[PDB]
Amino acid sequence: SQRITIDPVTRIEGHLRIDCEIENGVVSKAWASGTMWRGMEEIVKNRDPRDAWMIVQRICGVCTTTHALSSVRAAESALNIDVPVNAQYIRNIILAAHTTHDHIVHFYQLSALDWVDITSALQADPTKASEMLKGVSTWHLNSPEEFTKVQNKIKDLVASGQLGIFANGYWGHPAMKLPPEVNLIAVAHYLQALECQRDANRVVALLGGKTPHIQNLAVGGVANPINLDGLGVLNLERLMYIKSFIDKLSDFVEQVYKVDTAVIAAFYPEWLTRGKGAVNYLSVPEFPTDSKNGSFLFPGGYIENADLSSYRPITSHSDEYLIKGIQESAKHSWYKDEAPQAPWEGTTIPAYDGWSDDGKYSWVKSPTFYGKTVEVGPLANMLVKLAAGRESTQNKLNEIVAIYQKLTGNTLEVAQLHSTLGRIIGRTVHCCELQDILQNQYSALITNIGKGDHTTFVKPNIPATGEFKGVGFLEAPKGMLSHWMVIKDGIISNYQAVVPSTWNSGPRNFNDDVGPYEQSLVGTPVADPNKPLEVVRTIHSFDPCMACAVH
Amino acid sequence: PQRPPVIWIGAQECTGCTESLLRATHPTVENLVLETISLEYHEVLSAAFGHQVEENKHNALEKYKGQYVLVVDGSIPLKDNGIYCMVAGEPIVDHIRKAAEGAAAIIAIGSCSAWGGVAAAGVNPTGAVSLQEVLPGKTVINIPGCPPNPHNFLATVAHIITYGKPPKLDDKNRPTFAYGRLIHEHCERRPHFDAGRFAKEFGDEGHREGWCLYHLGCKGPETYGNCSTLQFCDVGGVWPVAIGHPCYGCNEEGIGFHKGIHQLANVE
Ligand code: SF4
Ligand code: SF4
Ligand code: FCO
Ligand code: F3S
Ligand SMILES: [Cl-]
Ligand SMILES: [Mg+2]
Ligand code: NI
């Protein structure tokens, strides 16, 4: 038996330390630690409510857009403002296109090098690699010629002796299972992914004014001026340009990312039987389409003890059952006040005292829902949509299972989704369904402008006396996000962010119960404790964001 | 589904207005002709030639009577009974008047068809005139420039298709989204004009700091257009003034092809 530390964890956002006790070749106990704090909740305090979104957007530049949108929703909640429907269409297109970029970059740039051996790709036969994909994908850039050009780029990098960020990798590890040909296919798709994510961010830029960090929001709606006949504003030529980029995303997502997800599961089937982090799941509904902040295109809900048949639907961002359940504790975190706190009454008082296995070991707080630990993110999101009987989600999951069946002769049941690969699959399903969200909301905007509605902004009033509490919910790429604003005498008197990586990465809670990262690792086989690739594989499946988790 | 029909006829054209389509991105020229419209006549791209292509024009004018958009580039020459442009043995003015009879909408793409352009300048050797002068009973939509940004044309066609009418027009029948403002009333070098920071010759110190081009002959103060905002080629930052040369006034009758490059504009 022995104790290891993984510090830094790479191919994530931000600063993470993972500790593991290993006994008889398996992890017996783990600790997750966020090692950087800024105090973003304190920086935004005492300001005008209308200013918060530009400051708290900077909680994270990987999940850019998300904290901006959650912050304006929180002020609109406190103030009782109904957002114009055109402002909802624009906010929705931005969030859907951003999330497409975010999921593609996670699968390829951040996670693929846990599963893919770039050295092995030098041994591949490019023709055999291309032949393996016949009747599995219709993608137009799977030729032997494409794969030979990619293999020659790898050959040149190796021959230079400067491997840089590709160096001292896990090349030849016993947990690396792909044949040479599938390693070469994956590297070709890694490079092609960079073009698709760039198109997704061109959609975001044309509505946001730039990305990273959009600049088109307001408490009350958006800053885009809709005028089909205007010079220098959001006219029909600018809308046509947006549509030209929306139409470029589908083929890569459906014919490359969706297919690769099924192929990784076919070669790594034991990863369907490990990495369960929780038995409770939460997601919020997303993409409102009415004039009163509701009528969501995607559903939300709460699953308890993995029972889909008895789940509780969530159809409103004003649901008092959801609001009343959320608390955070700092018993095992570097803050002073330890008992569970509702976020409108939250404090964030730093109290660093160094690392202790049984005391404080993280800057991440510990969130609970009516006293229980909960997993958020794409696995939660997919399982809630299956509980709701959403036929689009059923059908997309079935397409991934059908490729896995063609490759292995085996099928995939819902029980196998509570796992490191199920989490990966839920993310892929979400990216696929978002392409229909983009087509739907573009068409809705064009049709509404044609009815003569050009409205985008309702100017707020803020009473100079009274105390007003608001909450803004959002289904972010990593899971349910909430921003909690208290207004007193016209200024922000409290501001608390509860972020999806806070739920999943937070340390042991007030009752010493284990959160999803720490739970998921128990039982992990580790062939070489000096090179713990198997631990990093499960942690990457949650898509850690530690600027998000800690703020 | 069926696509909206277009008939394109060139008169005294240089082909630059067709070539603008090969730079377009929203839509690209391949998506324009396979997805957005049915291009029923266009001599630059047509597989058919000669008697076959003249039959396919006549068949389309009948099939789509009341439905097609007619587009013309180039000026129309009236001198000596039409003979300075003859196609299939007939004056181009006769082909254009015949096609105008059944059109749902009529567009003059480029300065030549919009107001006579370079071909009508100086002594005007051929008696070249605008499309509106040849069709006095019709409302001609004018999309000037030499050539315009292609999307000034493509977004006008899209408004007709999507919303069933033309875009809003000014008193010269130009779409307001593209021609509603003077270039100098939306130019990023106006701070330099205001401060008296001027380039005096190409390659001087002010020119090499991106100062105002007024004293090089810039016609922005007297030209309506979107060249400083939409710009050209969708790469970012590309229009004549941004590259270092004054506006010549190519959009605007009486400016481009009349005033010298280095002649000073009137300022309102
Ligand atoms: S407007 Fe300019 S580009 Fe178009 S036909 Fe005339 S000379 Fe050529
Ligand atoms: S004169 Fe020309 S360069 Fe100077 S501000 Fe006016 S339009 Fe711009
Ligand atoms: N997605 C994302 Fe960032 C995290 N965790 C937020 O919200
Ligand atoms: S010469 Fe023409 S292209 Fe624009 S910058 Fe002046 S109107
Ligand atoms: Cl409008
Ligand atoms: Mg917080
Ligand atoms: Ni983030």
Would you put residue B187 in left (φ > 0), alpha (ψ -120 to 50) or beta? beta
| DSSP bridge pairs for B195 | none
Tokens of A170: 């896990």
| 8 Å CB contact between B120 and B134 | no
Residue with tokens 């690969």: A421
CA dist., res. A392 & res. B109, Å (int): 46
- What is the rounded distance in angstroms from the CA atom of residue A121 to the CA atom of residue A147? 10
Pairwise CB contact (< 8 Å): A228 & B167: yes
Is A329 exposed, middle or buried (CB count within 10 Å of its CB: 0-12, 13-18, 19+)?
Answer: buried
- Is the CB–ligand 4 distance for residue B247 below 6 Å? yes
Residues near A65 by beta carbon (within 8 Å), at least 6 away in sequence: A57, A94, A95, A98, A204, A208, A211, A214
Contact A3, A29 (CB under 8 A): no
Burial classification of residue B181, based on how many CB atoms lie within 10 Å of its CB (0-12 exposed, 13-18 middle, 19 or more buried): middle
Strand pairing report for B105-109 and B69-73: parallel
Ligand 3 site-directed mutation target among A13, A15, A58, A60, most atoms within 8 Å of CB: A60
Please say whether the beta carbons of A282 and A431 come within 8 A. no
For residue B28, the tally of other CB atoms under 10 A from its CB is 16
Provide, for chain A, the percentages of residues in helix, strand and coil under a 3-state DSSP scheme, each rounded to the nearest 5.
Answer: 45, 15, 40
In eight-state DSSP terms, residue A255 is: I
The experimental method is: X-ray
Can you tell me which residue has the tokens 């129309």? B76
CB atoms within 10 A of CB A174: 10
Distance CA A402, CA A411 (A): 8
SS3 of residue A4 by DSSP: strand
Burial of A140 (0-12, 13-18, 19+ CB in 10 A): exposed
Residue of B nearest to A235 (CA): B177
Residues of chain A contacting residue B177, judged by C-beta atoms under 8 Å apart: 228-231, 235-237
SS3 B53: helix
Residue type, B130: S
Helix (H) or strand (E) holding A262: helix A258-267
B4, B37 in Cβ contact below 8 A?
yes
Interchain contact, B181 vs A235, CB within 8 Å? no
What's phi and psi for B150, nearest 5 deg?
A: -60, -30
Measuring CA to CA, how many Å separate A125 from each of A158, A173, A188?
18, 22, 14
Position A63, amino acid = C
β-sheet bridge partners, residue B128: B77
CATH of domain B2-178: 3.40.50.700
Q: Rg for chain B (alpha carbons), in Å?
A: 20
B21 lines ligand 1 (CB under 6 A): no
Q: Judge contact between A250 and A435, C-beta under 8 A.
A: yes
Token duo for residue A73? 């929703």
User: Which residues touch B74 (CB under 8 Å, ≥6 apart)?
Assistant: B10, B11, B12, B13, B14, B17, B85, B110, B112, B113, B119
Q: Angle of helix B50-63 relative to helix B92-101, nearest 10 degrees?
A: 30
The contacts of residue A469 (CB under 8 Å, 6+ apart) are: A78, A344, A484, A485, A486, A487
Residue in chain A closest to B158 (alpha carbons) equals: A236
Q: Is the previous residue joined to B147 through a cis bond, with omega within 30 degrees of 0?
A: yes
Distance CA A406, CA A411 (A): 9
CA B212/CA B204 separation, integer angstroms: 12
Q: Ligand 2, atom 4: nearest CA belongs to which residue?
A: B212
The SS3 call for residue A163 is: coil
Task: State how far the Cα of B178 lies from the Cα of B158, in Å rounded to an integer.
Answer: 14
What six digits make up the tokens of A194?
């960079």
Look up residue A351 and give its two tokens. 């109290």
Query: What are the helix and strand counts (H, E) for chain A?
Result: 18, 15
Asked if residue B233 belongs to a known ligand binding site, the reply is no
Residues of B in contact with A447 (CB under 8 A): none
d(CA A139, CA A189): 11
Helices (DSSP H) in A209-257: which residue ranges? Answer: 236-246, 250-252
- Provide, for chain B, the percentages of residues in helix, strand and coil under a 3-state DSSP scheme, each rounded to the nearest 5: 35, 15, 50
Contact residues for A387 (Cβ-Cβ < 8 A; gap 6+) = A301, A303, A308, A309, A311
CA angle A525, A531, A537 (to 5 degrees): 55
The H-or-E segment that residue A439 falls in is helix A420-450
Q: What are phi and psi of A527, to 5 degrees?
A: -70, -40
What is the end-to-end Cα distance of chain B in Å, rounded?
51
* Alpha-carbon span A60 to A209, nearest angstrom: 18
How does DSSP classify residue A13? Answer: B
Contacts of A357 (CB under 8 A, 6+ apart): A31
CB A94 within 8 A of CB A150: no
Q: Within 10 A of A4 (CB to CB), how many other CB atoms are there? A: 17
Cα-to-centroid distance, B141 and ligand 1 (Å)? 16
Pick from B41, B113, B125, B119: nearest CA to B74: B113
Resolution (A): 1.2
Q: Ligand 7 centre from A60 Cα, in Å?
A: 5
The bridge status of strand B69-73 relative to strand B38-41 is unpaired
DSSP A366-401: EEEETTB--B-SHHHHHHHHHHTT-HHHHHHHHHHH
Query: What is the C-alpha separation between B140 and A358, in angstroms, rounded?
Result: 82
DSSP B5: E
- Hey, where are the domains in chain B? 2-178, 179-268
Q: How far apart are CA A541 and CA A264, in angstroms?
A: 13
Rounded Cα gap, residues A137 and B193, in angstroms: 59
Asked whether A311 and A387 are in contact (CB, 8 A), the reply is yes
What are the two backbone dihedrals, phi and then psi, of residue A467, each rounded to the nearest 5 degrees?
A: -120, 120
Q: Say how many CA atoms lie within 13 Å of A371 toward its Cβ.
A: 1
How many residues comprise chain A?
Answer: 551
Q: Distance between CA A500 and CA A482 in Å, rounded?
A: 9
Q: Per-residue b/e over A475-512, b at no fewer than 16 CB within 10 Å?
A: bbbbbbbbbbbbbeeeebebbbbbbbbbbbbbbbbbee
Beta bridge partners of A492: A487
What CA–CA distance (Å, rounded) separates A452 from A59? Answer: 38
- Residue identified by tokens 């509570």 is A418
Q: CB of A452 within 8 Å of any CB in chain B?
A: no
**Domain A2-550 coded CATH 1.10.645.10:** yes
Q: Given an 8 Å threshold on Cβ–Cβ distance, is A231 in contact with B178?
A: yes
Separation of alpha carbons B91 and B96, rounded Å: 9
Are B38 and B3 in contact by the 8 Å Cβ rule? The answer is yes
Reference A217, options A74, A38, A97, A338; nearest CA is A74
What 3-state class would DSSP assign to A542?
coil
Token pair for B159: 């408004």
Q: What is the sign, positive or negative, of the torsion defined by CA atoms of A541, A542, A548, A550?
A: negative
The dihedral sign for the CA sequence A263, A267, A270, A274: negative
User: Is A230 within 8 Å of B177 when comparing Cβ atoms?
Assistant: yes
Tokens of A312: 């509780």
Question: Does residue B12's CB lie within 6 angstroms of at least one atom of ligand 4?
Answer: no
Angle between helices A180-208 and A144-160 (to 10 degrees): 90
B52 vs B56: CA distance, rounded Å: 6
**Rounded Cα–Cα distance for residues A431 and A101 (Å):** 9
B229: its two tokens: 């905002």
CA pair distance B265, A222, nearest whole angstrom = 39
Give me the residue spans of the domains in chain A. 2-550
Given a contact cutoff of 8 angstroms between Cβ atoms, the answer to whether A374 and A368 are in contact is: yes
SS3 A281: strand
Question: Are residues A143 and A184 in contact, defined by beta-carbon separation less than 8 angstroms?
Answer: no
Measured CA distances, A3 to A21, A22, A422, A550 (Å)? 5, 6, 29, 25
Per the structure block, which two tokens stand in for A66? 């998300």
Across the interface, whether the CB atoms of A232 and B154 are under 8 A apart is answered no
- Residue A487 has which token pair? 């207004």
Give CA–CA dist A214/A94, Å, rounded: 9
Helix ranges (H only) for A132-257 are 144-160, 180-208, 236-246, 250-252
Shortest CA distance to A435 belongs to which of A277, A199, A231?
A199
Phi, psi (deg, nearest 5) at residue A293: 65, 25
Q: Are B131 and B96 in contact (CB under 8 A)?
A: yes
Q: How far apart are CA B242 and CA B213, in angstroms?
A: 10
A241 contacts chain B (CB < 8 A): yes
The amino acid at residue B77 is P
The first and second tokens of residue A449, run together, are 């402008």
Dihedral sign for Cα B249, B255, B258, B262, please. negative
Helix (H, G, I), strand (E, B) or coil at B92: helix
Judged by DSSP in three states, B210 sits in coil
Give the three-state DSSP class for A19.
strand
Q: Round to whole Å and give the CA distance between A96 and A84.
A: 19
- Eight-state DSSP code of residue B12: B
Dihedral angle sign, alpha carbons of residues A116, A120, A121, A124: negative
Q: Are A494 and A346 in contact (CB under 8 A)?
A: yes
Radius of gyration of chain A (CA): 23
- Do A458 and A56 contact (CB within 8 A), yes or no? no
Pick the CATH number of B179-268 from 4.10.480.10, 1.10.10.60, 1.10.3470.10, 2.40.33.10: 4.10.480.10
Nearest-angstrom CA–CA distance, A522 and A525:
9
In whole angstroms, give the CA distance from residue B7 to residue B27. Answer: 18
Tell me, yes or no, if B27 comes closer than 8 A to chain A by beta carbon: yes
**Cα separation of A312 and A383, whole Å?**
12
Distances (CA, A) of B29 to A410, B26, B36, B252: 47, 9, 10, 27
Q: With an 8 Å Cβ cutoff, is B230 touching chain A?
A: yes
Element (DSSP H or E) covering residue A444: helix A420-450
Are A403 and A253 in contact, with CB atoms under 8 Å apart?
A: no
**Gaps in chain B after residue (C–N beyond 2.5 Å):** none
Amino acid of residue A457: F
Please tell me the distance in Å from A105's CA to the nearest CA on chain B: 25
The answer to whether A248 and A103 are in contact (CB under 8 A) is no
Q: Are A218 and A457 in contact (CB under 8 A)?
A: yes
DSSP class per residue in A47-110: S-GGGHHHHHGGG-SSSTTHHHHHHHHHHHHHHTPPPPHHHHHHHHHHHHHHHHHHHHHIIIII
Beta bridge partners of A17: A33
What is the C-alpha separation between A504 and A277, in angstroms, rounded?
8
Ligand with an atom nearest the CA of residue A551: 6
Q: Using the beta-carbon criterion (under 8 Å), do B181 and A244 form an inter-chain contact?
A: no
End-to-end Cα, chain A, rounded Å: 35
Nearest-Cα distance to chain A for B99, in Å, is 28
Distance CA A172, CA A120 (A): 8
H or E element in which residue A128 lies = helix A126-131
